[PDB]
Amino acid sequence: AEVTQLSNGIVVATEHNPSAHTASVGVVFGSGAANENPYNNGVSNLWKNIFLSKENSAVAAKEGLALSSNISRDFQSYIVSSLPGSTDKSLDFLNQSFIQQKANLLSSSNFEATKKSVLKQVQDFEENDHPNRVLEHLHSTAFQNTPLSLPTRGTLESLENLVVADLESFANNHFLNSNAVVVGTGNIKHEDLVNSIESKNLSLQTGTKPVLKKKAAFLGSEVRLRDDTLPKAWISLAVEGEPVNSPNYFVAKLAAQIFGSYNAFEPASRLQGIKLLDNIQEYQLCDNFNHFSLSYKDSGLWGFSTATRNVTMIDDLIHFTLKQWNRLTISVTDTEVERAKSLLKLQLGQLYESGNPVNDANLLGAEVLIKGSKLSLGEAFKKIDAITVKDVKAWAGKRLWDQDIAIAGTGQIEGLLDYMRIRSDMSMMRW
């Protein structure tokens, strides 16, 4: 029900949900913010904001379209959502203003205004968006001196020396046809889509993007940007997790769903099936925490990201959740496994099926770029319910028992004890 066909160049991937309204056609490239050097960084976000600029969006809005884009750590996407009877308009707009000539987009008035707005919103993100910036510093210190370490939005110091030559070089080096996947979600049928991509000739280039010299290797590290102006203490620690197209991927997502996510002020998240919430609820050790499991192309992370207003008992929160992490290897039960199985099925269903047909476009483009064909919601559910407690114990002994962690913090984090205690509290002496 998620059909994929390889044409002369590009790969077309689509899914036809005939009850949805807005059909959404776009192209998803396989060169995100980890396919460049740290000096031209932020050229992916700059390309996204060039595509989303006032000129391009007014041209798209006069015809009845609505642009979208999403830059991630290996795929970047350009989505033109539209009405269901109007997608040949979407296709030839995306041809005429992104795939062929872009001289209307890349002259030094629109590029100057776009670069100024990008500089303002990146520095506003760096000052006033605290949990995302420490997840970003966690990525920057986990995979350091190695191309997965890069900021997605780009840093300010490597964004004020970018001109149109950088964007044209990136569009020549990474906006290819053996690197691109065109996607269709919403209610377009498959064959009218490829009929309209093969009627009007649509091909970006012919070549191949440059392969990287250094693969993503985890380096157990530590960083702290302690700003004691801030009222909270945002820390986040994470180990090396399993990447995409790895056999231990769904057990990593299940082991994240075992500990779940929490919010101390909602009275329905204080009653979950976590054993950690009987330790962190008598002195109110944190405000929220969420156990992520990110899986990029070469490697990935596995850890929790919190926020703490009780900045004196930070080490107790760290120690309690790390003992709960060691409970995965030594004595995890089966009722936690089945609770996390049902909750992981619910979360993947809420992610894969939703009202917006551009998130499905981004997910379908990513997992057709890296894998080759999309596995359905049924096969994912079968691979989830085929997981026993011993597979979780084997994976937790593989990737969580005494492994190197990487910590990224900000705020009032002097109460955070320093590194060797946190590293050697990942392994207890069997109680």
């Binding site: 530590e222 320093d418 590194y419 060797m420």
Partner: protein, 48 residues
């Protein structure tokens, strides 16, 4: 009269203790390898 047993136990004790001293120097440098090689970067903050 304790000469033979004293020098023998001394040989045992200083062999064990000097090997323990070298191993403890190694484990001290291991436990402090995360502190001897930390780096501080200070860019000046913007005024309010």
């Amino acid at each position: 009269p304790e000469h033979d047993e004293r020098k023998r136990l001394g040989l045992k004790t200083v062999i064990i203790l000097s090997s323990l001293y070298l191993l403890s120097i190694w484990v001290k440098k291991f436990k402090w390898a995360g502190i001897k090689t930390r780096k501080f970067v200070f860019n000046p903050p913007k005024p309010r």
